[PDB]
Design an enzyme around this catalytic site. Sequence first.
Site, PDB file in Angstrom:
ATOM      1  N   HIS A  40      -4.182  -8.791   2.255  1.00  0.00           N
ATOM      2  CA  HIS A  40      -2.570  -8.758   1.894  1.00  0.00           C
ATOM      3  C   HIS A  40      -2.027  -9.526   3.135  1.00  0.00           C
ATOM      4  O   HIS A  40      -1.013  -9.820   2.695  1.00  0.00           O
ATOM      5  CB  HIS A  40      -2.207  -7.388   1.697  1.00  0.00           C
ATOM      6  CG  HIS A  40      -1.897  -6.515   2.840  1.00  0.00           C
ATOM      7  ND1 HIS A  40      -2.540  -5.269   3.601  1.00  0.00           N
ATOM      8  CD2 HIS A  40      -0.692  -6.691   3.709  1.00  0.00           C
ATOM      9  CE1 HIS A  40      -1.858  -4.895   4.293  1.00  0.00           C
ATOM     10  NE2 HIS A  40      -0.650  -5.479   4.394  1.00  0.00           N
ATOM     11  N   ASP A  84      -8.922  -4.487   0.306  1.00  0.00           N
ATOM     12  CA  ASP A  84      -7.882  -5.155   1.338  1.00  0.00           C
ATOM     13  C   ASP A  84      -8.860  -5.564   2.523  1.00  0.00           C
ATOM     14  O   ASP A  84      -8.740  -5.199   3.513  1.00  0.00           O
ATOM     15  CB  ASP A  84      -6.830  -4.461   1.474  1.00  0.00           C
ATOM     16  CG  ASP A  84      -5.834  -4.910   2.036  1.00  0.00           C
ATOM     17  OD1 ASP A  84      -5.820  -6.205   2.107  1.00  0.00           O
ATOM     18  OD2 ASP A  84      -4.920  -4.251   2.540  1.00  0.00           O
ATOM     19  N   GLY A 175       3.272  -4.276  10.234  1.00  0.00           N
ATOM     20  CA  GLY A 175       3.027  -5.141  11.493  1.00  0.00           C
ATOM     21  C   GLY A 175       1.535  -4.982  12.143  1.00  0.00           C
ATOM     22  O   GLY A 175       1.211  -5.732  12.864  1.00  0.00           O
ATOM     23  N   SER A 177      -0.884  -4.100  10.212  1.00  0.00           N
ATOM     24  CA  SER A 177      -1.657  -4.510   9.016  1.00  0.00           C
ATOM     25  C   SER A 177      -2.837  -5.568   9.431  1.00  0.00           C
ATOM     26  O   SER A 177      -2.458  -6.533  10.130  1.00  0.00           O
ATOM     27  CB  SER A 177      -1.031  -5.041   7.780  1.00  0.00           C
ATOM     28  OG  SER A 177      -0.447  -3.951   7.132  1.00  0.00           O
ATOM     29  N   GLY A 178      -4.080  -5.338   8.877  1.00  0.00           N
ATOM     30  CA  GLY A 178      -5.145  -6.050   9.267  1.00  0.00           C
ATOM     31  C   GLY A 178      -5.872  -6.052  10.455  1.00  0.00           C
ATOM     32  O   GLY A 178      -7.009  -6.504  10.818  1.00  0.00           O
TER      33      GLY A 178
HETATM   34  N1  LIG Z   1       4.268   1.548   5.136  1.00  0.00           N
HETATM   35  C1  LIG Z   1       4.091   0.900   5.829  1.00  0.00           C
HETATM   36  O1  LIG Z   1       4.939   0.193   6.532  1.00  0.00           O
HETATM   37  C2  LIG Z   1       2.445   0.868   6.478  1.00  0.00           C
HETATM   38  C3  LIG Z   1       1.794  -0.406   6.707  1.00  0.00           C
HETATM   39  C4  LIG Z   1       0.602  -0.537   7.232  1.00  0.00           C
HETATM   40  C5  LIG Z   1       0.099   0.869   7.540  1.00  0.00           C
HETATM   41  C6  LIG Z   1       0.671   2.024   7.234  1.00  0.00           C
HETATM   42  N2  LIG Z   1       0.059   3.300   7.805  1.00  0.00           N
HETATM   43  C7  LIG Z   1       2.037   2.027   6.836  1.00  0.00           C
END
Ligand SMILES: NC(=O)c1cccc(N)c1
Length: 223
Positions: A40, A84, A175, A177-178
């Site tokens: 993503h 993902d 932020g 993510s990944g």
């Molecule tokens: N809900 C969010 O902004 C989010 C994004 C990535 C990971 C997690 N745990 C939450």
Amino acid sequence: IVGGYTCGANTVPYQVSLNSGYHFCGGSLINSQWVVSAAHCYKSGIQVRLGEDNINVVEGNEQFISASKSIVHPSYNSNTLNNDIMLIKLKSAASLNSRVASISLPTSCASAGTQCLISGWGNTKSSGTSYPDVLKCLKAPILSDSSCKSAYPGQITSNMFCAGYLEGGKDSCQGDSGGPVVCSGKLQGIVSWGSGCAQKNKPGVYTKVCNYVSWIKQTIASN
Ligand SMILES: NC(=O)c1cccc(N)c1
Ligand SMILES: [Ca+2]
């Protein structure tokens, strides 16, 4: 990262920042030529930033390397975030050193209760917004599959796991993510999604890397 701590400069040397004019996702260095991140997080024109601590300041240990190719998992479903995971190849090999280092892939899946290290430059607030300039870290255990599926009925596949604290207060967030979830020296997770951040009974959900090791190794070897 909500409820974590400042890692310390270059103490997570496999952590990368993906930059497209600004930081937008994390990733993990798995060899001198390849980074693992979340599907993503896909976009064109990615620059991989290695050796970072403060992402807004050049401190002297960074390497900035453009991606030459990105490979999203063939079964990635953007509606459900199943599978993902993506691979990013660097246009030139990273120069490996104590502050820019690869993380090993799993040889098997990790058990519930295993403690892991989650890291990133994402939001540190569970309501509202504040982004750190420096890398944040969180120690958190893998949760049982039943507690994960109970929190997210109808949304958890065999390619996902939960980690964190059902009481809330400590989690990954936007932020992050990944980025990596490392347990016992192996990359077991990728920061994927969750319902808010650090909310009670809503732990973070992570891509289950151990299911992808064969795909990763075969894809790298052919690209
Ligand atoms: N809900 C969010 O902004 C989010 C994004 C990535 C990971 C997690 N745990 C939450
Ligand atoms: Ca920097």
